[PDB]
Design a protein around this ligand. Structure first.
Ligand SMILES: [Mg+2]
Ligand SMILES: [Mg+2]
Lengths: 514, 390, 109, 110
DNA sequence: TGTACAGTGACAAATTATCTGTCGTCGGT
DNA sequence: ACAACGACATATAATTAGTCACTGTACATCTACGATACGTAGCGGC
DNA sequence: TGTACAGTGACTAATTATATGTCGTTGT
DNA sequence: GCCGCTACGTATC
């Protein structure tokens, strides 16, 4: 084991004592000790015994023997031990759970106990503040602790299962999460809508952003599936994005690492994982998600805080003009956000390295050039209805709609896996199991509405209105209920319901991409 | 105007110059004074001309003439005006409306213009911070400005009409406003309800709390009518409140001064005022009525922050246990809050005065003891249907 | 303070030209025989620059000495200490603790 | 930093008994001929007190001198400066500023 | 002239571990 | 012959612009919305 | 060993208003 | 054509 003490900058009295010690450092003759000790007593204006004591402290200890020594009672209160423990316990107990008691309130409890004990001289307010001083101080360091982070090139990710998985190359481990964007948006007229949701997908080996989905829709496994589709497929943008670089990323993960939200623990994402072959894993804590969490802070600082309609990070920062100053449509915010991610964010230097651009680290990081996946082969992203049973005459029933198709009647009594798109359920793909291998059977079409379209949400909402009204349900009556609601909304003086208008602007951006 | 300047913290070099000047205070003779200069040139390691300059700087300025004055460039920027105006106005435009542009983002706009103009020395980010520094301190100072206060027995409450009400005596001007309390309450089964609303009625002359209403109910002209009758009628509380002094406070205002809420600018309150004979007035800003707004902070600080289920003054300070740690019902919270107002708050020192309690100042401040109004004549609190036909 | 006010010996002083310095620190000089007019300085690099005279407000016309302003302040502090709530306040703070505990035992069961 | 870590010359140092001092300030002493190990001292009223040793992590085994670590640091700075806030990274800033500015629709009536 | 309470520098009074003499005692020359 | 002041040349620290290592703090679903009032327009019954 | 960017002390290079000499000139 | 009860627009805490 080891120990040492070193003097800090000497005080002026300690400097003088240093000159006296140097005056007493040379001699070898008892006569010269006596001479220089007596002149040192005169120089310090002290007794001869005092100079002897000074030399002895510098002999048995360092320069810290000729600096002053602090008192033994420094940092001990002179009030009784009962009172110091009473003040300490009263403060701590006053803060259990939701309660928040101030030192002044503690002082009132001190005075109340003093009346019970008939103590004419209890600790006053300043003494209570001093007694609680270190208790309040420690707290202020514990809240501020910095984490070292990772040093680079070697990285692993802690899962909620307690397992640590390494990250070895680009597209080894993707991560994803959603946020509100801190910007208010307007419709194509200039009336306010909502703050949109931004979903990002990001590669853990390179920190390069793989894809995004920006829209008014609340988070869902459908939103995660749209974001995976954009991440995975090769990307191209028209001149209206004004890009100078290309996003240039594509291909599919080996693992997908997420929060514990229902969106990512949904059966829909699990079916996407099993078809594309990328097992999912849940993060242990939000602090393990640093690679996906931090980019939202970076976007707030570099992008969103400069745009009209900025709402601040939270209500306490909200500019009073945030609703007076909203101007961007969703299509215009996406033009800005994609220019920023392609020309700026993915072109910045990767932290934890300093040598490499984030994209260059993705591209050089690849084990091999990934083979592009044809867009039609992302029909793996369709939801599966785990079974339906082929009724007599080849019918299937699904969400109240009745479907028939080109071969189904030969399979009556079997169970088939319907695979469907929630954006348009008027046609469904039917798959069956043969030799424990799922195979394609046919496309099934909702009888009598093959020329229409219906999202699953329209069919579900119209079905509730039919059940509430007490009317029967069939393909024609369900279709009539849907087109009648859109006609009734068209009679409204605003033609607005929040979702109908947010969907109109979102769909207008979605179908302007081509 | 007068124009004086005084030196401070003189000594560090200057004591050596001061001792030189002390040795030179008198032109003793043309023969001897020159010798004193040539001797002082041993204490300062400098020529006769440096000592003659020191003596002239002393005689024309006094003690500051010993101290080295700061350079004429101090606080000026060498980058040139173009860049100093470009940086200042870029910041200001980028923090217009809802935009909140940072100095780093301003530096990016500096590099962007310098690239357009083919400049080679666009100011560095460290110098951008320095150029924007003065206009950030101003913003921080302009938020921090303190205001003094009414001092002594004289008080003139400003209305939105620009007229000031001179508050002369107890019950001359009551004031009212509403706040959420910061505690989640539970039902009699222990399940979460909501945070109550508190209404107070304060007399401006005494700052005594003349009545309250506490409930889950919404601000309404009904809640204001209930706060008024509780303020006006004599008050009675049972022993389950454990009160040790009496809320002996009652009687009718001459004026009622309020915020712009629809409870107060309403036909119902106007019909209450016309029948009680008091005039309603509108508070010009939320800072003219500190007499009503500060009691609400005192209650957070003296009462509610020390109760279970406390929610903080805002969402960023919300104790995370508030929804799990709620215990009190509305009947407990009223039994605590009424005690606090009768035993503590109305019995504490009126802060403008320092030598009266709020209640003592109210009671002594009545121009006369008012006669209690029969509870039946508080029917005026009834709403009126104006014009229905038989 | 806003409007060019300073607080000295519990009196309030209004500066003649001081309102441009609201929120700034200043330092000030006074003759103890008559504190009714006070002299205010900006502190600066090694030097104090005279900024304005400032005048006391709300006081009587007769000139006010420093010791007299202390006298008014200690007499007023003695009244506040005399009038203070005391035992009645301690009783509230105890009974407020009790009620919380009986509810406390029922912490959602 | 948490777990008893310190940053010096861009290397990360882990202290042997240091972990209880997270969020505290410490001072530190080293021999420029070899900065693989650093001596950590607590600060007090007239004295520094020796607290514990700390060792560099993630580096090569060969003993690291101070001048050599400065060199490693300027090689990183030089490499980063080759991506010289390079023009793509700024060209966006005008167009972001000019999709805005152009859209003055906040209060446009007829 | 918002307002009024919790917290905070600047200073005075009570207490104490510590510095200084003075003399006595022990050891070295 | 001695003292004071300036014209001019010369060396000098004060101030600012720039560099770089160390570090504090937000990313972590989240205020547009609920609750009154007045003011005006409308549906069928009379 | 979370994360990565805006803001910040400690130090250094560039610019400059300013103190220091040396001598000439004027007044005494 | 006239009149008590509902319903929508606007403002403020
Ligand atoms: Mg999430
Ligand atoms: Mg109000």
């Amino acid at each position: 084991l080891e120990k040492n003490v070193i003097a800090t900058q000497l005080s002026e009295e300690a400097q003088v004592k240093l000159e006296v010690i140097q005056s007493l450092l040379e001699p070898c003759d008892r006569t010269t000790y006596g001479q220089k000790l007596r002149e040192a007593a005169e120089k310090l204006n002290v007794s001869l015994r005092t100079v002897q004591r000074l030399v002895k402290n510098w002999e048995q200890d360092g320069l810290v023997g000729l600096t002053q020594t602090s008192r033994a009672d420094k940092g001990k209160h002179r009030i009784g031990e009962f009172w110091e423990n009473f003040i300490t316990k009263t403060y701590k107990e006053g803060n259990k759970g939701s309660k928040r008691m101030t030192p002044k309130q503690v002082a009132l409890r001190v005075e109340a106990k003093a009346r019970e004990l008939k103590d004419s001289k209890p600790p006053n307010y300043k003494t209570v503040l001093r007694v609680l001083a270190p208790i309040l101080e420690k707290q202020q360091k514990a809240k501020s602790i910095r984490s070292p982070g990772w040093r680079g090139t070697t990285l692993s990710v802690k899962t909620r299962e307690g397992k640590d998985l390494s990250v070895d190359y680009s597209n080894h481990v993707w991560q994803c999460d959603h946020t509100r964007v801190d910007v208010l948006l307007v419709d194509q007229h200039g009336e306010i809508l909502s703050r949109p949701w931004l979903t990002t997908v990001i590669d853990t080996y390179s920190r390069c952003i793989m894809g995004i989905n920006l829209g008014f829709d609340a988070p869902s496994s459908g939103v995660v599936a749209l974001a995976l589709r954009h991440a995975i497929l090769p990307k191209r943008y028209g001149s209206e994005y004004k890009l100078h670089c290309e996003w240039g990323t594509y291909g599919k993960p080996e693992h997908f690492y997420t929060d514990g939200g229902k969106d990512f623990r949904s059966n829909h994402l699990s079916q996407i994982g099993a078809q594309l072959g990328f097992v999912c894993h849940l993060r242990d804590r939000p602090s393990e998600g640093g690679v996906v969490e931090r980019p939202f802070k970076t976007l707030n600082d570099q992008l969103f805080s400069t745009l009209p309609g900025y709402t601040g990070s939270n209500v306490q920062e909200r500019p009073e003009d945030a609703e007076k100053d909203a101007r961007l449509t969703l299509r215009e915010l996406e033009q800005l956000l994609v220019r920023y991610i392609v020309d700026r964010y993915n072109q910045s230097i990767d932290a934890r390295m300093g040598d490499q651009t984030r994209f260059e680290r993705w591209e050089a990081g690849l084990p091999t050039v990934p083979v592009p996946i044809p867009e039609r082969d992302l029909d793996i992203c369709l939801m599966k209805q785990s079974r339906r049973t082929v009724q007599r005459g080849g019918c299937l029933q699904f969400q109240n709609l009745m479907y028939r198709g080109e071969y189904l009647a030969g399979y009556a009594g079997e169970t088939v896996n319907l695979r469907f798109d929630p954006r348009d359920i008027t046609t469904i793909l039917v798959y069956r199991q043969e030799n424990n291998q799922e195979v394609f059977l046919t496309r099934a079409h909702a009888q009598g509405l093959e020329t229409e379209q219906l999202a699953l949400d329209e069919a579900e909402a119209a079905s509730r209105r039919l059940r509430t009204a007490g009317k029967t349900i069939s393909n024609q009556s369900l279709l009539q209920e849907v087109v009648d609601r859109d006609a009734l909304v068209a009679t409204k003086k605003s033609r607005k319901e929040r979702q109908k208008l947010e969907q109109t602007v979102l769909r207008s951006a979605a179908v302007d991409e081509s």
